[PDB]
From a paper:
GRP78 is a molecular chaperone that resides in the lumen of the endoplasmic reticulum (ER). The GRP78 chaperone belongs to the Hsp70 family and it is composed of two domains, a nucleotide-binding domain (NBD) joined by a flexible linker to a substrate-binding domain (SBD). The chaperone function requires ATP hydrolysis, and substrate binding accelerates its ATPase activity. The malaria parasite possesses a functional GRP7815, which has been shown to regulate eIF2-α–mediated arrest of protein translation, an essential function during the schizont and gametocyte stages.
The crystal structure of PfGRP78-NBD in complex with ADP was determined at 2.3 Å resolution, and the final model included four chaperone-nucleotide complexes in the asymmetric unit related by non-crystallographic symmetry (NCS). As expected, all of the molecules showed unambiguous electron density for ADP and a Mg2+ atom in the active site, since these compounds were added prior to the crystallization process. In PfGRP78, the ATP binding site was sandwiched between the IA-IIA and IB-IIB subdomain interfaces. The bulk of the interactions with the base and sugar portions were associated with the IIA and IIB subdomains, including all the residues involved in H-bond contacts. The presence of ADP and PO4 in the active site is consistent with a post-hydrolysis state, and it has been previously shown that product release is the rate-limiting step in GRP78 and other HSP70 ATPases19. All four molecules of PfGRP78-NBD in the asymmetric unit showed large inter-lobe interacting surfaces involving 117 residues and an average buried surface area of 2230Å2 (range from 2168 to 2313Å2). The first was between residues Y39 and K80 (K81 in human), and the second included residues K80 and E290 (E293 in human).
Author numbering: 27 to 404
Write the structure that this text describes.
Amino acid sequence: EGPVIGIDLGTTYSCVGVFKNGRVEILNNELGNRITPSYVSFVDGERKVGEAAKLEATLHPTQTVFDVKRLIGRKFDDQEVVKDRSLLPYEIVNNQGKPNIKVQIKDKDTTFAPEQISAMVLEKMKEIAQSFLGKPVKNAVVTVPAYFNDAQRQATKDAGTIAGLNIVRIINEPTAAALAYGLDKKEETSILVYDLGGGTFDVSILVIDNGVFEVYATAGNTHLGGEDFDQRVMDYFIKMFKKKNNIDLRTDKRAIQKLRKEVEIAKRNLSVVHSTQIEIEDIVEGHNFSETLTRAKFEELNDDLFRETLEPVKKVLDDAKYEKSKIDEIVLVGGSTRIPKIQQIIKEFFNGKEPNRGINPDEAVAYGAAIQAGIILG
Ligand SMILES: Nc1ncnc2c1ncn2[C@@H]1O[C@H](COP(=O)(O)OP(=O)(O)O)[C@@H](O)[C@H]1O
Ligand SMILES: [Mg+2]
């Protein structure tokens, strides 16, 4: 019936798009960003969603929730949830077989199902769409990884219900990005979707035959992405600060919070320019942090992790029994595909083959979902 919006509900960032006047508009949040962190905090009884929540992550690790997409539709006993709980800094309890996030609210223990946190992120995406369109939004197209089972797909629809959204269709993330580049109805082609995000890495082979995408092969690394590239820069500067001033910055959380924020900005900056400056006045009492980070240094610290992304690319091609030449189209997805070195490594692997270009790679999935939303509307 009414407006239908497309939403990219990602592990680390979220993005919303609308299809109006025969084109897609990727919407800005309160801070003027087309992307919103999938973080929720409950510090001093104040619920915050997005970048305001992401900032509390270091100072308040028990009150800040994120990476809830790794728990959604799963049992506490799942092999992947056991590996994740050991990595997540906030408390995850076993609520009679189902994982629950335990936080303190008004001095009381409060438990949330993973779909309750995801719904708070969807509530923010829905509100951005409502004030932009000037109309009530109920229907939405939401994306999910191609590997997501029936439980994970339904748990996402349930997060939508809590948020007041009727998720009319759940589509695959690599199918959404290929749709964004108008690759549907290309008749007899093979598409390789290289998706490197904040926390996960996914490679998918898509085949299009009469406007219908078939997910031919998938591979990846659930613990490889952007936040890893940060940690490597983080490690380097902590080591450097220890050898210069004899102070371990890891003991001071206010110091780690300032450095973490500056490292994320510095990394982004290196995607457009070749050098950047990290300046933090009084990182600790009586010490000013001032260091240069070159694009070259950023690449040297992450080279192994960058090339590691080619291992699942080799696997999809091997599983599909494909030569490199069989790939007709390359689609880059994820905030980390903005890294000039990552683009160069994929191009070099595909012997000079240029990928598709025209959409910000962190917005391509939400762009695809809004195209799908417009098809459903008619
Ligand atoms: N300009 C950029 N250059 C490099 N990395 C970027 C840039 N923009 C975003 N990123 C990184 O992209 C990652 C998030 O990826 P994204 O695809 O948006 O989310 P998700 O993984 O949740 O699907 C973060 O690690 C972020 O720092
Ligand atoms: Mg994504």
